[PDB]
Design a protein around this ligand. Sequence first.
Ligand SMILES: CC(=O)N[C@@H]1[C@@H](O[C@@H]2O[C@H](CO)[C@H](O)[C@H](O)[C@H]2O[C@@H]2O[C@@H](C)[C@@H](O)[C@@H](O)[C@@H]2O)[C@H](O[C@@H]2O[C@@H](C)[C@@H](O)[C@@H](O)[C@@H]2O)[C@@H](CO)O[C@@H]1O
Ligand SMILES: CC(=O)N[C@@H]1[C@@H](O[C@@H]2O[C@H](CO)[C@H](O)[C@H](O)[C@H]2O[C@@H]2O[C@@H](C)[C@@H](O)[C@@H](O)[C@@H]2O)[C@H](O[C@@H]2O[C@@H](C)[C@@H](O)[C@@H](O)[C@@H]2O)[C@@H](CO)O[C@@H]1O
Ligand SMILES: [Cl-]
Ligand SMILES: [Cl-]
Ligand SMILES: [Cl-]
Ligand SMILES: [Cl-]
Ligand SMILES: [Cl-]
Ligand SMILES: [Cl-]
Ligand SMILES: [Cl-]
Ligand SMILES: [Cl-]
Ligand SMILES: [Cl-]
Ligand SMILES: [Cl-]
Ligand SMILES: [Cl-]
Ligand SMILES: [Mg+2]
Ligand SMILES: [Mg+2]
Lengths: 310, 310
Amino acid sequence: TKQFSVPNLPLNVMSNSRVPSLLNAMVVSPDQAQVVQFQNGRCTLDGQMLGTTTVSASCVARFRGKTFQAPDNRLGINLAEISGEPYHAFESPAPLGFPDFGDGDWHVTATKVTPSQLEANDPVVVGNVQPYNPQFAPHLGTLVVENPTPDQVATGTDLLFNITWLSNRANNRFNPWVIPNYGSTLTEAAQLAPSIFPPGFGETIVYFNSTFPAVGATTHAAIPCLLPQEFVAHFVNEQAPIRGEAALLHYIDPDTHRNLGEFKIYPEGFVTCVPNVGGTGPQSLPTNGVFVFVSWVSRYYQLKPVGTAG
Amino acid sequence: TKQFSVPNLPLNVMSNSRVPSLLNAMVVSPDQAQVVQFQNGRCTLDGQMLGTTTVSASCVARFRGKTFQAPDNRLGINLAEISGEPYHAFESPAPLGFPDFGDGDWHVTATKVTPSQLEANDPVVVGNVQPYNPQFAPHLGTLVVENPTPDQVATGTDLLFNITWLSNRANNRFNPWVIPNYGSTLTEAAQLAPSIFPPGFGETIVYFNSTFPAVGATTHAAIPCLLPQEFVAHFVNEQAPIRGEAALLHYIDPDTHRNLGEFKIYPEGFVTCVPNVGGTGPQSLPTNGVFVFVSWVSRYYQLKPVGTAG
Ligand SMILES: CC(=O)N[C@@H]1[C@@H](O[C@@H]2O[C@H](CO)[C@H](O)[C@H](O)[C@H]2O[C@@H]2O[C@@H](C)[C@@H](O)[C@@H](O)[C@@H]2O)[C@H](O[C@@H]2O[C@@H](C)[C@@H](O)[C@@H](O)[C@@H]2O)[C@@H](CO)O[C@@H]1O
Ligand SMILES: CC(=O)N[C@@H]1[C@@H](O[C@@H]2O[C@H](CO)[C@H](O)[C@H](O)[C@H]2O[C@@H]2O[C@@H](C)[C@@H](O)[C@@H](O)[C@@H]2O)[C@H](O[C@@H]2O[C@@H](C)[C@@H](O)[C@@H](O)[C@@H]2O)[C@@H](CO)O[C@@H]1O
Ligand SMILES: [Cl-]
Ligand SMILES: [Cl-]
Ligand SMILES: [Cl-]
Ligand SMILES: [Cl-]
Ligand SMILES: [Cl-]
Ligand SMILES: [Cl-]
Ligand SMILES: [Cl-]
Ligand SMILES: [Cl-]
Ligand SMILES: [Cl-]
Ligand SMILES: [Cl-]
Ligand SMILES: [Cl-]
Ligand SMILES: [Mg+2]
Ligand SMILES: [Mg+2]
């Protein structure tokens, strides 16, 4: 009998669930090629996270591990959870929050996190991770940092990594839809968050975008996700049981309470709308509105078209 | 009619409200030398943020601005809000989320954020900010990045800054309690979040600590804050009116459901406990417990001592 709700925070104060950035737009992308299968920002309406999704904003697209010396002055990393708890294979696709961008270089900045190594001196290590490299095995807990600086880092150093920026592979653009190949063969427990297929009734998937230093992207420096991280954290906190086939939301002007558009959020944890034909759908709406739960509805509830005709 | 609550997320999945890091401890510091007056992580129980506190996890201890050339190849920054909205003086102490560490160097990593500047090439600028230097004027919207790399950045470049690490000043240790001098004279509107005084009844302030690359700290790489960021986000979302002089919380083992300790959270937005005499108070409790609202209480409700005798 805990009733379902969404966070009533304005869109442009909530954050991406695949990079640590503010949300500043929502778009649709119906005629786009890739499957939709992000591993971060995946959460059911009753609060079960899927893939590698963490509830922790400060773990989104981070990773942590201990260093070892790999061939040709490459820096191997044995992964742990960002909390420092051990990471074991065969249970999830990768550690919690682990970045899910497969189509380009991760230019990373790391710091030492052992307090005894933080009494003095420069704790930073930088480098790049190439998820398309053959020595990228996050399911089994290991990856490589190419061209580290310093070249020489003592074995067993505990490092916490951030993605400072992403870039395209040579002669391609960087597609932020493409998830990594996590390697191995995943147990049933460690299964990827499923892919999401286009719903019916003229509906198209809604993406929440952030501007992000993603250099050479197909999207013009924009990272899409299926749910704001605050939605993930809200559903995990609430654990409201699913009581309908989908959940109708209204996107409200917060001051004047006018309804700016109708959306559906499905049990599997993604939002849809029906774009006004020939326009950008929700992209033209102001970004300072607030989502509110109206009611559960069935799958065939017909949404009012949102946006302008063009 | 909206009843008060706190997020029922385990402590060690919630995040600091003064740096973007996981919480991994809670401590007390009764014989602490400094006043308690953080500007980030400040929120009333009914959801009014104070100081520079933002609701947005991805704005905590970040800042943004446009570059200009300052004397001696110093890199001046004209601040904006992290959202890119303009920042104007005389309304807040500094932009939303602006870092509130005054006692040491900020070693910062910035990226370009203009999509047209992100089609190719390396978008990173690094440097350090010295909040104790005379050209640090965050209230009026301007600061300086010393020793930038590149040392030549075009004027008017939009940059988003993160604090990669902090370090002590020469011949001192870095005290993370010390807030910056924001400069100028603050209007009534732009007032600092007030300082917090020790409450009675044998209570002492509870700090939520993160391990963080703060080099040479008085705390050994630990950043304290008064509220998890998720508490800030929760109170802003809920807006539950204050209906008592303080709010009694229990810190519950989430599986065994047993009570590990009693705490009070006050309307002004800080947590207290009564340490068992001679011990570290809440510091010895497991960090995977969950805070639960019991009831409103008066200021003179007597907490059972928490922790061990030593
Ligand atoms: C090794 C190096 O410096 N290479 C330069 C190019 O940059 C590399 O380009 C690759 C794709 O072709 C890939 O994106 C690499 O990640 C990228 O290397 C990164 O960026 C450079 C600038 C350095 O900082 C490296 O340390 C870093 O790993 C560069 O290509 C241009 O920029 C990159 C970011 C990419 O957008 C590419 O498409 C652009 O043409 C070229 C020309 O500037 O110069 C070197 O080859
Ligand atoms: C300019 C420089 O390289 N200085 C070195 C010292 O580092 C500086 O120390 C200052 C305090 O005395 C202050 O913290 C500066 O921020 C710090 O400079 C930073 O760290 C160094 C290592 C470089 O990366 C700089 O680019 C950066 O700005 C260094 O002091 C020792 O480390 C620092 C972090 C601090 O903890 C200090 O107390 C330590 O003694 C010394 C000895 O290694 O070497 C240079 O002087
Ligand atoms: Cl019911
Ligand atoms: Cl709602
Ligand atoms: Cl989690
Ligand atoms: Cl240690
Ligand atoms: Cl049903
Ligand atoms: Cl219906
Ligand atoms: Cl009532
Ligand atoms: Cl209620
Ligand atoms: Cl509660
Ligand atoms: Cl805010
Ligand atoms: Cl009482
Ligand atoms: Mg899992
Ligand atoms: Mg203000």
